Amino acid sequence: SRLKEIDGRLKSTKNEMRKTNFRMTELKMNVGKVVDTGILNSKINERK
Amino acid sequence: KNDDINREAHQLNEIRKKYTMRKSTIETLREKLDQLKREARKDVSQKIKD
Amino acid sequence: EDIDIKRKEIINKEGEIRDLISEIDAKANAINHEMRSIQRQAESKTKSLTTTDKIGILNQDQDLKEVRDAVLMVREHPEMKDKILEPPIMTVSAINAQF
Amino acid sequence: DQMRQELEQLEKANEKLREVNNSLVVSLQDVKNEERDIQHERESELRTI
């Protein structure tokens, strides 16, 4: 019974590891969202 | 490899936004200034005939 | 968009590989403790007196096992060790086998 | 960058999970060895009786 409890804890820990790794990689993939630093500069120059 | 391709993507995104910036220059300076000067005339034959 | 897709694919591959890291750690820990347990068993067997002393001879019979337990308790009990000694099979040694 | 900060935090969390998993496997293997020893003792005693 103790072995089964520890095995269940082990499986839960492995699932948590997989979830955390995939969330980390999703955080990495969130860098690729299109960040834009363009049009504003033209209007800045014109206004100045 | 992923980081290298991401850096290339960011460079090209900045390039595209510089292009959009030049497009905005076109829209305002090329046209809005053109429209402002064209309408500022109000056909001076107006004030002249006044 | 294409680079974002490739980045997400490679990143999911990285996450999946990272999953197969701590699982390998679990396997390594289990195998290491198997190593330790089996090595401890080997060490205990090596420590065994292999029936050298007459107390080791006492390992060969249930009543002799009780006698061995009594001898061990006597060793653990100094008050029961000075007054009560090991049996003449252990304490007393004959000169030869015929004696 | 903020996603990278959370990436670092969850990397620390994943390393902690690795340590917890290793400790749990240590305990599991020790209890397995205890099970094997108890079962062998049971077999020996039952055979003798």
From Swiss-Prot, chain B:
It is found in: Nucleus; Chromosome. It comes from the Eukaryota. Sumoylated by MMS21. The flexible hinge domain, which separates the large intramolecular coiled coil regions, allows the heterotypic interaction with the corresponding domain of smc6, forming a V-shaped heterodimer. Present with 892 molecules/cell in log phase SD medium. Component of the Smc5-Smc6 complex which consists of KRE29, MMS21, NSE1, NSE3, NSE4, NSE5, SMC5 and SMC6. Acts in a DNA repair pathway for removal of UV-induced DNA damage that is distinct from classical nucleotide excision repair and in repair of ionizing radiation damage. Functions in homologous recombination repair of DNA double strand breaks and in recovery of stalled replication forks. Belongs to the SMC family. SMC5 subfamily. This is Structural maintenance of chromosomes protein 5. It comes from Saccharomyces cerevisiae (strain ATCC 204508 / S288c). The lineage of its organism: Eukaryota, Fungi, Dikarya, Ascomycota, Saccharomycotina. The chain holds residues 697 to 746 of 1093 of the full protein.
UniProtKB/Swiss-Prot annotation, chain C:
Sumoylated by MMS21. It is found in: Nucleus; Chromosome. It comes from the Eukaryota. Residues 6-43 form a coiled coil. Belongs to the SMC family. SMC5 subfamily. Present with 892 molecules/cell in log phase SD medium. Acts in a DNA repair pathway for removal of UV-induced DNA damage that is distinct from classical nucleotide excision repair and in repair of ionizing radiation damage. Functions in homologous recombination repair of DNA double strand breaks and in recovery of stalled replication forks. The flexible hinge domain, which separates the large intramolecular coiled coil regions, allows the heterotypic interaction with the corresponding domain of smc6, forming a V-shaped heterodimer. Component of the Smc5-Smc6 complex which consists of KRE29, MMS21, NSE1, NSE3, NSE4, NSE5, SMC5 and SMC6. This is Structural maintenance of chromosomes protein 5. It comes from Saccharomyces cerevisiae (strain ATCC 204508 / S288c) (Baker's yeast). The lineage of its organism: Eukaryota, Fungi, Dikarya, Ascomycota, Saccharomycotina. The chain holds residues 399 to 497 of 1093 of the full protein.
Swiss-Prot record, chain D:
Component of the Smc5-Smc6 complex which consists of KRE29, MMS21, NSE1, NSE3, NSE4, NSE5, SMC5 and SMC6. Present with 339 molecules/cell in log phase SD medium. It comes from Saccharomyces cerevisiae (strain ATCC 204508 / S288c). This is Structural maintenance of chromosomes protein 6. Belongs to the SMC family. SMC6 subfamily. It comes from the Eukaryota. It is found in: Nucleus; Chromosome. The flexible hinge domain, which separates the large intramolecular coiled coil regions, allows the heterotypic interaction with the corresponding domain of SMC5, forming a V-shaped heterodimer. Acts in a DNA repair pathway for removal of UV-induced DNA damage that is distinct from classical nucleotide excision repair and in repair of ionizing radiation damage. Functions in homologous recombination repair of DNA double strand breaks and in recovery of stalled replication forks. Probably plays a role in structure.
